[PDB]
Amino acid sequence: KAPGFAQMLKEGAKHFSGLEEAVYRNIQACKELAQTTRTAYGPNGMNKMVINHLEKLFVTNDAATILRELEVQHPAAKMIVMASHMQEQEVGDGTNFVLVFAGALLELAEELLRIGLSVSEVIEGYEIACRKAHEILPNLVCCSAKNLRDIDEVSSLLRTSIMSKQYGNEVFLAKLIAQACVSIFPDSGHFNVDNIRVCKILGSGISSSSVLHGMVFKKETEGDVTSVKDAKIAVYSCPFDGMITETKGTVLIKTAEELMNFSKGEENLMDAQVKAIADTGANVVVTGGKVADMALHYANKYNIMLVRLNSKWDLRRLCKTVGATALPRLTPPVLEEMGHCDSVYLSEVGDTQVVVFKHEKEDGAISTIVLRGSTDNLMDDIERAVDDGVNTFKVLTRDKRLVPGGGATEIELAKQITSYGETCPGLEQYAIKKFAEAFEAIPRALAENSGVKANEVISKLYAVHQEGNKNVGLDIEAEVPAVKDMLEAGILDTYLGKYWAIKLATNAAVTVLRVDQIIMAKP
Amino acid sequence: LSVFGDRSTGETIRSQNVMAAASIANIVKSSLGPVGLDKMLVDDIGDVTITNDGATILKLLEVEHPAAKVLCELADLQDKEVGDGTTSVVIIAAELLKNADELVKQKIHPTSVISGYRLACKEAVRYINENLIVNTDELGRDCLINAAKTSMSSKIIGINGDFFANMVVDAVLAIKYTDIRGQPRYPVNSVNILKAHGRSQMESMLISGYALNCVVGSQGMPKRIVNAKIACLDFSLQKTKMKLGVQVVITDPEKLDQIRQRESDITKERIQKILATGANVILTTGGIDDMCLKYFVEAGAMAVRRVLKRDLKRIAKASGATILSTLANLEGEETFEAAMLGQAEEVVQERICDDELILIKNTKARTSASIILRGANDFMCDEMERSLHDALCVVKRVLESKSVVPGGGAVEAALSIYLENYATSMGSREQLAIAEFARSLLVIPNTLAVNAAQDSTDLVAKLRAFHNEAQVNPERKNLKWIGLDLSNGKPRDNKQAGVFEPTIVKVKSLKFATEAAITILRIDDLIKL
Amino acid sequence: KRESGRKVQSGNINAAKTIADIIRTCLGPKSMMKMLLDPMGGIVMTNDGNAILREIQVQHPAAKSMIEISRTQDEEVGDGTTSVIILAGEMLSVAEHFLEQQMHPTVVISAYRKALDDMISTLKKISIPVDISDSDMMLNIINSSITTKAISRWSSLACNIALDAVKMVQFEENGRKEIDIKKYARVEKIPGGIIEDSCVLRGVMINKDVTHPRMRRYIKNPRIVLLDSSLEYKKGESQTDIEITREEDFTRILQMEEEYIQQLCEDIIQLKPDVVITEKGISDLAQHYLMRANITAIRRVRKTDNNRIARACGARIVSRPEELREDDVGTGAGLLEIKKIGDEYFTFITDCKDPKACTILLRGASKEILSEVERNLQDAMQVCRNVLLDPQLVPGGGASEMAVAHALTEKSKAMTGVEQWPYRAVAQALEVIPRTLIQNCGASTIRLLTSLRAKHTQENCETWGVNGETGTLVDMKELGIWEPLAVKLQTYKTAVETAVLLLRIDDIVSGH
C-alpha cells in the first residue's frame, strides 16, 4: 500500500531518506568502530576478551588484533580499517590514532551537516587543516635521535612505544629490543623488522628473557651432535617414517619370518637413505613431522645433525634466509636445493637448549629475541609489543624527529589550527575549528582510560599552552589529574607516526564523507 | 485464613518500608546544603511551589505510605524541638534502613540491629560532647568574622567582606543581654538597616544607637537634644473624630461653628499638658497639628509627626516609654506623668543624604543599634541588606547556643572512625550494626559533595583520613576537626572558616533518626482492613 | 506520577525547546502564521506569540513556567516577549555540556550567571542616547509598532498621543521617575468620528450615564465634590434587612429614611456645587435631591479615579457628606460636559492643568476599527515608557545579539576552567535571533550569519545587523530598527533566569 519506501529502487537496499540522513548512518558505523578501540588507547588501555575464530580465548589490547578478529562488515568502517592497514606501511604504530581521530572528524562533521553546511565544504576544511597541521608539526619537534647507536639512547626513546602494549614491563623490553636493534644499525640503509625475529618459549616470566644472534629455534637438537659448521643444510617436509613407493610397490607378506625380512630390508634401506645425506656433503637434516627411532641413530652414525621444526612458519623462515627448500620425498639426495650457513650449533639459555643458525664467517645482520613466559597468550601479547617497538626505530632510520606525546601535540596542534580558523574568513572555518577539536579526543581518551574527568585535563593542558609551556602532556596517574612535562619524563612520539596518521585519517574521513549512498551490485 | 481485609508478611515487608523511606530521602537528598537544588511541588489543583528547603518540602510532600508518614511525623518532632536538621534526619534514617536491610539478608535479626544502633547513638553523643567548643572567641579572637564573611560572599557585598564583617560582629555583641540567670540570648528583631546614596559602599557607618527615617519638620526646633525624657503618644493631636465608621450627625449650622472652635481650643490644654511634662524628644504616631508644631518651636521640643508604628514600637522598648493610646482616662484628660517618659542621654539629627535620620543614644535598656547602608544605588543597598540580614543570623545562632560543633560532615566523618573502632570492642551480634551505623553517617558528606559538584568518593575519603590521623596520635602535625568546604571543593578547618552548628542539632538528629529506623525495623508485617 | 534523575532536566529542556520551536518563525516583520485547530473544527490564523501559547494546552509544568513568565513580560513590556522564549529555549537546547558531559547544573548555572553580567555590560557599551525633547526621533522609534498596521495612515497621530500622554504621567520629581499607564492613563472608547478625531483628554473621563435630564449640560467653572460614603439611610452594623408589617411603624421608618437622606443632601448643596461624585451607589430618594438641585448625579468611581479628580480640579476627599468643608470645590476646572457624543454619554472635567494623569479619547468609525487603534496605541505608550525610563537604544536586527556574542567569545579566551564551554555556548545561542530573521526572509542562513559575525569582528559592533524585509545586511544607523535598552536587558535576564530555573529543577514531585 502506498506511500511505500522513498528512494528505494536498487535491489531493495536500505536507502535512508532525506529525513533519515544517509550520511549520518555511515558515520555511526565509524563511531562504533572507535568505541571498540577508544578504551584501549594509552598505557592504561583496557584489554579485550577476544574470542578467536577457532574458539580460542585471548585477552589483549592491541588494535590490529582487535580488528583482525572483529569481522568488520560495514564498508564505511572498512575504509578506516584500510587506513589502519596503510598505517602499518611506512610506520608500525599510531593505529588507534587513525580510529580515534577519524571517528572524531566524522562525529564532529555531523554537527556541521546538521547546521546545513555542505559535505563538499566540510571536506575542503579538513584538507586545509591537514595541510596546515603538516606545517605546524615540524615546529613541535622537541628532540631528535642522536643516532649514536647507544643502548642507553635507544632504550630511553623506545619506552613510549612499548607502553600501551605491555605496561609495567617497559624497562626489560626496552633494553632487550635496544640490544637487538643496535646490532643491525651498523648495516646502514638496510634495517628492517624481518631481521629482528621473535621466539617464544614457555618459561618462568618475562624477566627471564634475553637476546641471541642468528635464527633461534626453541626445539632443541634431537640428534647427539653438539655443533657442526656444515653449510649444506638439507630440509625435508616429509617425516622420517615407513617408506612408501611412488610406483605400485606392492608389498605382500604372509609368514612371520617374511615380516622380519621386510622389516630388516626397510632398516637397510633407511641406513642407505641417511648414508646418501652424508654422501652429498651435508651433515645437517631438518624434519617437519615425527622422527623415527632407527633413523635417529643413523643421524648419529654419520654425525648428521638432526633438526626438528614442527611449525610451518619456522620452516619457511629458513627457506628465505639459507635457501634450503623442503622437498616432498623422504630424504632425496638433492644437493642442488640445499641451503648455506656459516655456523649451526646448540646453546642452552634459561635452562633450555635451542637450535641456533649463527653467521660467524659472514658479517651477520640477523637477530632474535628469545622471550620467556608462563602463558602462551602472554608471550603473544608481548610479541605484538616487539613489532610495534622495533618498527618505531625502523622509522628512526629515516629523518630522526621526535615530538612530545601524552596528548601534548594534540592540544598545541589544535591550538595552532584553531587560531588559523578564527582569522580565516568564510565557511571553511567551521570545519577547520572542528578539525582542532578532533585532536582533543586523544587526550580525552587517555584521561577516560585513566579514570580522570577529561574536561579538566583539556582545561589544564590549554592553560599551560596559553602560557607557552609546550611539551606538556597528561600525567598518567589515578589519584592525580594534573599534568607534567613529557620532555622531563622522557615520553616522546615519532614525527612520521603523527604525520602519516593525520594524513591517512583525514583521507579516510574525507573518503567516507564523499560517499552518500551504499548500493549493491552483481557481476 | 478468611478475613475482611488483607495481610502480607515476610522479609519483603521490611524491604517495602526500606525502599519507601529511601524514596522519601531521595526527594530531599539533592536539596541538601546551601547549594541545594530547587524542586517542584505539583499540588492537586495545579499550583507549583518551587523551593529547595528540605523542611518546606516535607511539610508539603504528600506520599500515601505508612513508613513515609512516620518520617513526616518525625519531621515535626525535629522542627519543634530545634527547628533545623530535618533533612539530614530523613537521609540518615534512610541509609540506616538500607544498610540494616542488608544485614537482615545476612541472617542478622532486627533486634540485634536495634541494639547496635542504640549503643552507637549513645557513644556518638559521648564523642560529640567530648569534642565541642563552648560559646567563646567573641572579642580578641576570630571565631566570627570568618563566619559572617563566608556567608555574605555570595552577593556583590563580597568585594570587601572584612569591612562589612566588622560591622556585624561589633553589633551582634552590642545586642547582648543576659536577662535570665545568665542565659544571654539575642533578639530576632535585630539592628535596623537603613540606606543612603553615599557615593560608594565603603561610606556605610556603624551607629551605636537607633536610626529613624523621619524629620521634625519646622526648622525652629533644635536638632541636638540631651534631655532624658522621651514622650510616646499614639493619640493624634490633630482633629479627633468619633470613628471612621461613625460620622457625628450635625444638623444646625451654629453647632458646626463651636465644634470647630472647641476642637481648636481643646488642643491648647493637650499641648500645655504635654509640654509641662518636660519631654523634648517627642514622637507622635497619628500626626501632629500644624499649630501644635509651632508650640514646640517656642518650647524648643524635638517633636516628630507621622512616625511608623513598628519603628516607634522599638523605641518604647528602648527607652521604656508606656505607649498611650488616649489621653482621656475615661472621665477627663491627662498625659500620665512619669509613665510615657523614657530615659536617654542624647538625641541628635545628623546629616545623611536625601533623608535626615534621627539618632537616639544611650537609652535605658535597648540592646539595639542601627546601620546606614551608604551605597551607590538602590540595587546594592537592597542586596547588602539581605546579605547582612542573613549573615547576622549566622553569628546570632552561634552565640545564642551554649555549645557548637564543626559542621560540613566533620561530626559524621569523625564518628565513622570512632564507632568503627568501638564495634571491635563489643561484639555479640552488634559489631556489624555499629559498623553500618558508622558507614551510614558518611552519606551526609557524600551528599553535600555531590550537591557541590565535586567527587564525593575523594572528599569523603580525605575527611576520614584527617580524622583518622587524629585518632592514631594527638600530635599537632595531624590535622584535627577538618570540615568540608563546598565552594573550593577541598577540606577546610571549620574552626578558622567559621562553619559551626548547634550541638543539639547533631545530637537530636542522630537520636531522632535512630529512633525512626528502630520504629520501622520492628515492622515485620502489615494488616489491611 | 513523578520524575527523578537526569530525565527531569532533559525533559524540561525538550518542553521549553518545544515551546520555542512553535514561535521560532513568529519573529520580525516577515513573521510566519500559525494554524490553531479549535475543538469545534475552527481555525485561527494569528501570528502573535502571546496569543498562540495562550490557546495551546500544555502538560509539562516546565512549559507552564515558560508561558507564565511570558505573560509577566507582556504586563511590563508589550514587545520582545517572543525573544525571551526563543533565547530561553536555545540557552537550554545545549544539552551536550548538561548531561552528555556529566557537568553539574551548578557549574552551568555559574557560567550562565557570569555571562549575564557580561551581556548586560556589553549592551550598555553599544547603546546610544536619545534626545527625548525632540519628538521627531521618537516618531522613528515608535514606528516599529505602527509599521505594517492600519494606523500608518495616521502614524504621526499615534506618536503624539502616546508621547505626550506618558509625559504627563511621568512624575520625575520623585527621583525614580515611575510611570503608571494602567491607572494614570485610563483609556476609554468613544463611538463616532474617525481615526483622525482621536486625541488625549487633559483630565479624567468617567463613563457614567445620564439618568435624568435635570443635570448640568455645559459649565465654564465646574465645582466637583468627592466622598466615599453612600447617600442612603444609615443602616445598622450588620446587613439585616428592615422587615415591617404595621402601617403605623411605616411612617416612622419612612421618616427616618427621608430625613437622614434629606439632611445629608442639604449639606452637599450648601457649597453650590455642579456635580456630586460618590464612590458608592446613590439610591432613588437621594437622586431626587440631585435633580432638584440641578446638579449631575455620578456614582461608582474608584479610589484612584477620584484621587486624580482632586488633583485636576482641586476637590477634597471626605469620609461622609456631612463633613464637607468649603475646600471641596473644583475651582479652576475647565468645563463640565455630559454630552451624548456618539450615542453614549461621557463626563468631561478637562482643565488647563496636568494632574499627573490623563485620559485617551479613542474616536473611530466602528468598533472594529476602534479596537484596532486601541491595541496599537498601548504598545506605543509602553515604548515611550521604556525610552523615557532609560533613554538608551541598542542596535536591533540581530546586531545586539551578535555584538554581545563577540564580547563573550573574546572574553572567554581568558576564562580558565570548565565554565568556558557553557560560557561560549550562551554566545552561540544569541545568534538564533538573526537565524530566525534570515530564515523567514528566505535568504541563506549559514552564508549571511557567517559574514555577519565577521563584520562584528572587524567593523564596529554597534551596527551591521540584518534586514528582515530584504534579508541582506544593513547598518542600524541607516535603518531605524533601534530598540530600547530596558527591553533587551529584561529580555536577557528573563531568558537566563528562566533557563537557570528549569536547570535547577531535578525532581518533579506531587503533593499538597
Swiss-Prot record, chain A:
Residue numbers binding ADP: Y41, G42, G94, T95, N96, F97, M163, S164, K165, G406, D493
Q: Which CDD domains match?
A: TCP1_theta (cd03341)
A GO biological-process term? chaperone-mediated protein folding
For the modification Phosphoserine, which residues carry it? S17, S156, S207, S263, S311
Q: Which EC class heads this enzyme's classification? A: hydrolase
Query: Which residues does the record list as Phosphotyrosine (modified residue)?
Result: Y24, Y499
Broad class of where this protein is predominantly found: cytoplasm
Reaction(s) catalysed by this chain, per the record, are: ATP + H2O = ADP + phosphate + H(+)
Citing just one GO molecular function, the answer is: unfolded protein binding
Entry's Gene Ontology cellular component terms: azurophil granule lumen; cell body; centrosome; chaperonin-containing T-complex; cilium; cytoplasm; cytosol; extracellular exosome
- What EC number(s) has UniProt assigned to this enzyme? 3.6.1.-
Which residues carry the post-translational modification N6-acetyllysine, per the record? K312, K394, K460
Keyword terms, alphabetized: Acetylation, ATP-binding, Cell projection, Chaperone, Cilium, Cytoplasm, Cytoskeleton, Hydrolase, Isopeptide bond, Nucleotide-binding, Phosphoprotein, Ubl conjugation
Report the subcellular localization. Cytoplasm; Cytoplasm, Cytoskeleton, Microtubule organizing center, Centrosome; Cytoplasm, Cytoskeleton, Cilium basal body
Q: Which InterPro entries match?
A: Chap_CCT_theta, Chaperone_TCP-1, Chaperonin_TCP-1_CS, Cpn60/GroEL/TCP-1, GroEL-like_apical_dom_sf, GROEL-like_equatorial_sf, TCP-1-like_intermed_sf
Q: Where is this cross-link: Glycyl lysine isopeptide (Lys-Gly) (interchain with G-Cter in SUMO1)?
A: K453
Placement of covalent cross-link Glycyl lysine isopeptide (Lys-Gly) (interchain with G-Cter in SUMO2): K218, K248, K254
Per UniProt, Mg(2+) binds at D93
Which positions are annotated as binding ATP?
G94, T95, N96, S164, K165, G406, D493, K498
Q: What job does the chain carry out?
A: Component of the chaperonin-containing T-complex (TRiC), a molecular chaperone complex that assists the folding of actin, tubulin and other proteins upon ATP hydrolysis. The TRiC complex mediates the folding of WRAP53/TCAB1, thereby regulating telomere maintenance. As part of the TRiC complex may play a role in the assembly of BBSome, a complex involved in ciliogenesis regulating transports vesicles to the cilia.
Which disease is this protein implicated in? De novo genetic variants in nearly every subunit of the TRiC complex, including CCT8, have been found in individuals with a broad spectrum of brain malformations, and clinical phenotypes ranging from mild to severe epilepsy, developmental delay, intellectual disability, ataxia, and other features of cerebral malfunction.
- Tell me which family the UniProt entry assigns to this protein: Belongs to the TCP-1 chaperonin family.
Q: What is the gene called?
A: CCT8
UniProtKB/Swiss-Prot annotation, chain B:
Q: Single Gene Ontology BP term?
A: scaRNA localization to Cajal body
Cell compartment(s), UniProt: Cytoplasm, Cytosol; Cytoplasm, Cytoskeleton, Microtubule organizing center, Centrosome
Family annotation (InterPro entries): Chap_CCT_alpha, Chaperone_TCP-1, Chaperonin_TCP-1_CS, Cpn60/GroEL/TCP-1, GroEL-like_apical_dom_sf, GROEL-like_equatorial_sf, TCP-1-like_intermed_sf, TCP-1_chaperonin
> In which residues is ATP bound?
G33, G85, T86, T87
Chaperone as UniProt keyword: yes
Fetch the PROSITE patterns from UniProt.
TCP1_1, TCP1_2, TCP1_3
Where do the annotations place ADP binding?
G33, G85, T86, T87, S88, S154, K155, G408, E501
Q: Which residues carry this modification: Phosphoserine?
A: S2, S487
The alphabetical list of record keywords is:
Acetylation, ATP-binding, Chaperone, Cytoplasm, Cytoskeleton, Disease variant, Epilepsy, Hydrolase, Intellectual disability, Nucleotide-binding, Phosphoprotein
Q: Molecular function terms in GO for this entry?
A: ATP binding; ATP hydrolysis activity; ATP-dependent protein folding chaperone; protein folding chaperone; RNA binding; ubiquitin protein ligase binding; unfolded protein binding
Which positions are annotated as binding Mg(2+)?
D84
EC number per UniProt: 3.6.1.-
- The answer on whether this UniProt entry bears the keyword Chaperone reads yes
Question: What does the subunit section of this Swiss-Prot or TrEMBL entry state?
Answer: Component of the chaperonin-containing T-complex (TRiC), a hexadecamer composed of two identical back-to-back stacked rings enclosing a protein folding chamber. Each ring is made up of eight different subunits: TCP1/CCT1, CCT2, CCT3, CCT4, CCT5, CCT6A/CCT6, CCT7, CCT8. Interacts with PACRG. Interacts with GBA1. Interacts with DLEC1.
Which disease does its entry mention? Intellectual developmental disorder with polymicrogyria and seizures: An autosomal dominant neurologic disorder characterized by a broad phenotypic spectrum. Main clinical features are developmental delay of varying severity, intellectual disability, seizures, and polymicrogyria. Additional variable features are non-specific pyramidal or cerebellar signs, and visual impairment.
Output the PANTHER family linked to this UniProt entry.
CHAPERONIN
Q: What is this protein called?
A: T-complex protein 1 subunit alpha
Q: Which organism is it from?
A: Homo sapiens (Human)
Curated annotation (Swiss-Prot), chain C:
Pfam families for the chain: Cpn60_TCP1
Chemical reaction(s) catalysed: ATP + H2O = ADP + phosphate + H(+)
Is the keyword Ribonucleoprotein assigned to this protein? no
The domain of life is Eukaryota
Q: Which residues carry this modification: N6-acetyllysine?
A: K208
Gene Ontology cellular component terms for the protein in this record: cell body; chaperonin-containing T-complex; cytoskeleton; cytosol; extracellular exosome; microtubule; zona pellucida receptor complex
What disease is associated with this protein? Neurodevelopmental disorder with speech or visual impairment and brain hypomyelination: An autosomal dominant disorder characterized by global developmental delay, impaired intellectual development, poor or absent speech, and brain abnormalities including hypomyelination, cerebellar atrophy, and optic nerve atrophy. Some patients have severe visual impairment, dystonic movements, and seizures.
Explain the purpose of this protein: Component of the chaperonin-containing T-complex (TRiC), a molecular chaperone complex that assists the folding of actin, tubulin and other proteins upon ATP hydrolysis. The TRiC complex mediates the folding of WRAP53/TCAB1, thereby regulating telomere maintenance. As part of the TRiC complex may play a role in the assembly of BBSome, a complex involved in ciliogenesis regulating transports vesicles to the cilia.
For this entry, the protein name equals T-complex protein 1 subunit gamma
Q: Which organism is it from?
A: Homo sapiens
The coding gene here is CCT3
